[PDB]
Write an enzyme that holds these catalytic residues in place. Sequence first.
Site, PDB file in Angstrom:
ATOM      1  N   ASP B  65      60.859  41.833  75.775  1.00  0.00           N
ATOM      2  CA  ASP B  65      62.228  41.815  75.265  1.00  0.00           C
ATOM      3  C   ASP B  65      63.090  42.718  76.146  1.00  0.00           C
ATOM      4  OD1 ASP B  65      64.512  41.373  73.798  1.00  0.00           O
ATOM      5  OD2 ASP B  65      63.554  41.728  71.862  1.00  0.00           O
ATOM      6  N   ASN B 111      54.370  38.598  88.447  1.00  0.00           N
ATOM      7  CA  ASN B 111      55.803  38.479  88.259  1.00  0.00           C
ATOM      8  C   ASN B 111      56.525  39.320  89.298  1.00  0.00           C
ATOM      9  OD1 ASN B 111      57.283  41.032  86.952  1.00  0.00           O
ATOM     10  ND2 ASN B 111      55.151  40.970  86.200  1.00  0.00           N
ATOM     11  N   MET B 113      60.141  39.642  88.587  1.00  0.00           N
ATOM     12  CA  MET B 113      61.392  39.408  87.870  1.00  0.00           C
ATOM     13  C   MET B 113      62.556  40.156  88.509  1.00  0.00           C
ATOM     14  SD  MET B 113      60.207  37.407  85.798  1.00  0.00           S
ATOM     15  CE  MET B 113      61.438  37.084  84.522  1.00  0.00           C
ATOM     16  N   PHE B 115      63.992  43.198  87.400  1.00  0.00           N
ATOM     17  CA  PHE B 115      64.893  43.728  86.345  1.00  0.00           C
ATOM     18  C   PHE B 115      65.965  42.701  85.987  1.00  0.00           C
ATOM     19  CE2 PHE B 115      64.465  48.357  88.168  1.00  0.00           C
ATOM     20  CZ  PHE B 115      63.240  48.531  87.583  1.00  0.00           C
ATOM     21  N   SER B 175      58.097  49.554  89.104  1.00  0.00           N
ATOM     22  CA  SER B 175      58.266  48.134  89.409  1.00  0.00           C
ATOM     23  C   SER B 175      58.031  47.892  90.895  1.00  0.00           C
ATOM     24  CB  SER B 175      59.654  47.630  89.013  1.00  0.00           C
ATOM     25  OG  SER B 175      59.810  46.248  89.372  1.00  0.00           O
ATOM     26  N   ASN B 177      59.005  45.237  92.208  1.00  0.00           N
ATOM     27  CA  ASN B 177      59.987  44.188  92.431  1.00  0.00           C
ATOM     28  C   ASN B 177      61.399  44.685  92.726  1.00  0.00           C
ATOM     29  OD1 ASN B 177      57.717  42.507  91.757  1.00  0.00           O
ATOM     30  ND2 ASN B 177      58.195  42.846  89.523  1.00  0.00           N
ATOM     31  N   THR B 178      61.614  45.992  92.760  1.00  0.00           N
ATOM     32  CA  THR B 178      62.867  46.543  93.239  1.00  0.00           C
ATOM     33  C   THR B 178      62.583  47.378  94.478  1.00  0.00           C
ATOM     34  OG1 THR B 178      63.907  46.547  91.042  1.00  0.00           O
ATOM     35  CG2 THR B 178      64.746  48.077  92.652  1.00  0.00           C
ATOM     36  N   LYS B 217      56.937  55.913  83.286  1.00  0.00           N
ATOM     37  CA  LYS B 217      55.992  54.816  83.493  1.00  0.00           C
ATOM     38  C   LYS B 217      55.630  54.696  84.973  1.00  0.00           C
ATOM     39  CE  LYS B 217      54.905  50.043  82.399  1.00  0.00           C
ATOM     40  NZ  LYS B 217      55.131  48.840  81.571  1.00  0.00           N
ATOM     41  N   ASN B 246      51.898  50.126  85.126  1.00  0.00           N
ATOM     42  CA  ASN B 246      52.685  48.885  85.303  1.00  0.00           C
ATOM     43  C   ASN B 246      51.819  47.850  86.014  1.00  0.00           C
ATOM     44  OD1 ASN B 246      55.071  47.198  85.376  1.00  0.00           O
ATOM     45  ND2 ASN B 246      56.278  49.065  85.580  1.00  0.00           N
TER      46      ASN B 246
END
Lengths: 335, 336
Positions: B65, B111, B113, B115, B175, B177-178, B217, B246
């Site tokens: 979410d 993934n 994604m 963010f 992450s 992904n950034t 995290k 993560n």
Amino acid sequence: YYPFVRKALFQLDPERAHEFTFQQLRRITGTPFEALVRQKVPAKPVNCMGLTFKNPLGLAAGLDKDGECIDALGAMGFGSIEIGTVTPRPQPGNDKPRLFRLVDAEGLINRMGFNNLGVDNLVENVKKAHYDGVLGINIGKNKDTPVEQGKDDYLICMEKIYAYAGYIAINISSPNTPGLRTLQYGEALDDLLTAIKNKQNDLQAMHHKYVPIAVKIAPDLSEEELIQVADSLVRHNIDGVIATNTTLDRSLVQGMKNCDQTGGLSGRPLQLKSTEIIRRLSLELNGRLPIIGVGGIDSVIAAREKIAAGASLVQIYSGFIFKGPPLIKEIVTHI
Amino acid sequence: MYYPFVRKALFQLDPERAHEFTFQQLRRITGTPFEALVRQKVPAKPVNCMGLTFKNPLGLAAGLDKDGECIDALGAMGFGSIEIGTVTPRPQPGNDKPRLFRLVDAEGLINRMGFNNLGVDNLVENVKKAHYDGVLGINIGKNKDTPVEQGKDDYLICMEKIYAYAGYIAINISSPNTPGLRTLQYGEALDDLLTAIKNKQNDLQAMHHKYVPIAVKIAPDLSEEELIQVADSLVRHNIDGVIATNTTLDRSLVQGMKNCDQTGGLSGRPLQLKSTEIIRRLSLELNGRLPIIGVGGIDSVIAAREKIAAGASLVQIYSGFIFKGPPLIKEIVTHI
Ligand SMILES: Cc1cc2nc3c(=O)[nH]c(=O)nc-3n(C[C@H](O)[C@H](O)[C@H](O)COP(=O)(O)O)c2cc1C
Ligand SMILES: CCCCCC/C=C/Cc1[nH]c2ccccc2c(=O)c1C
Ligand SMILES: CCCCCC/C=C/Cc1[nH]c2ccccc2c(=O)c1C
Ligand SMILES: O=C(O)c1cc(=O)[nH]c(=O)[nH]1
Ligand SMILES: O=C(O)c1cc(=O)[nH]c(=O)[nH]1
């Protein structure tokens, strides 16, 4: 769908459900009626211990103690089947009840006690089989035999099975044969492995056949104990090691029914411990002899975890009960 | 109601759409008598952690979410805590589709994604409409365009807007992904970020008259030295907890499997073992000084108990939820 079969079978007592399951598999093993349990799986050969294994997944010892359903079990996909544990004389093992299910932990606790019909009987069953996988015969000490003369029990067995076995598994890891695990330690072990490795050479000249010998170890060795065991196998040129058997540990199942029962925990609550053992063993053996990793394997990834930790092969028992034949197919296919 | 059938149907859709379809229905039944189609009764298992009281030890990990749109419905399923986010200060669309991949035989996910989220202001508005009686985590991160050396500003901006409403705050510096984000986990950067974050905590506590704990995290791809460094910094800076771990860049367990070479973070069963090793080493270095939330391949009671044995006080699931459904929330909460 196996989950519906398991709900029903789990309404029966662990040992009773086994007896019933194998009653059925015995009426069909080695007959066209094994179509009822056949499962096609890809070929995935692996060289290990000088043998070609049809595929890396094996049925760990304990399920088909007496070698009654080899054919039927192989029909399900197993690239190797380890029958036993057998002993020279028959014995009934420890007193019922001796088998308990930790369902929410997907684990099993057992103090069976080497319940087998003996080695002569096993050899007769093995003569009826037509299994194109690798057949391992697991051998153990008779209860009453003094652990000081346990070698004699192992060597008798080797003589009667050598001509019919693909590989031979030396069991010194059962926590349900009093004192047996001590055969993993020190000079006791060194003494036994010399007997065994000598008989093997003898038997190779007698029968003109090459049969690898693998020692099955317990997961409850200390780091020093494991270092000593690894050193011993290498020194006596043992062909392989099976890691590992069941554990006296209960740290992951406290507060669950049958947690306090006496015996060896298997299944998921042994998965991590079993992987740690293998990794440390692999680091010690450093490629000098192969490892067959058994212990808590209940999915492709977990199988691959044992491969990453050092094992050349994997074996399943508890996960076979809880996930059924489909696990055989998942693992062989994707490992 | 039987999840494996629900799962088969939903897996006919691509992962992002399956999620969107599921959330649309959750949103639609929130506040209706069809909210019980998902309510689950789970045993109360209260645990104190970071000075908060969690209904049970099982949380929904961040990422499911992102915008806090389904707190009430997800809460009805039995989670002791819900971690929403990650959010960034400004909204941003995240990386290009396709960016999310199932590894169904591995019971894993990959993934990238990036963010994808509507922004911190949109979330606080969702949070205000929520009725969840559990601990609400709120996970914040850096906008892509914000420079790495200035990333702390973006975290601080968020803390300002969420402090009134967060149960705890999660700092996402893990992450993959950034670009560069994971470098805030190292040296003077971690030290600087943690300083600014803890000073903001102090200013915000004085301004709102309540202490909202902060958990960082981390990633599971840290080495031993990097992990000791991370522990030491978290303690010296008095961070309230650490959430480990993560997604991982590792692919060793998924070699030969459809999508295993897609770029991004691997999660689910192929991360369980590594996430546990991390938690255990982190626990040794923390020596009980601050608590660890455990996330990483938990897909079963024993897997959850393994993380607790490694040193975690709580646990979170994401992938396992997707692959095993609410039965897992019940199983874990009940027998953990
Ligand atoms: C699609 C997807 C999106 C995620 N988004 C976030 C996120 O926004 N913030 C975060 O901290 N973790 C995020 N995660 C990581 C999860 O919270 C979780 O830590 C990770 O997947 C490991 O747990 P698991 O094995 O149960 O999935 C995401 C994971 C997935 C698969
Ligand atoms: C459907 C094909 C049958 C494949 C065999 C798998 C099931 C065997 C029955 C069985 N054995 C056991 C053997 C040892 C310990 C527990 C069980 C147990 O709890 C059950 C239910
Ligand atoms: C039981 C009612 C709700 C259960 C929630 C579990 C399913 C969520 C939807 C969902 N999300 C995903 C999120 C990320 C990646 C894949 C999926 C995916 O493949 C599906 C189907
Ligand atoms: O039957 C037994 O107690 C037994 C034998 C063995 O080798 N391992 C085990 O866990 N149990
Ligand atoms: O949404 C994302 O790309 C993302 C955020 C995060 O903190 N962790 C992750 O694995 N993905």
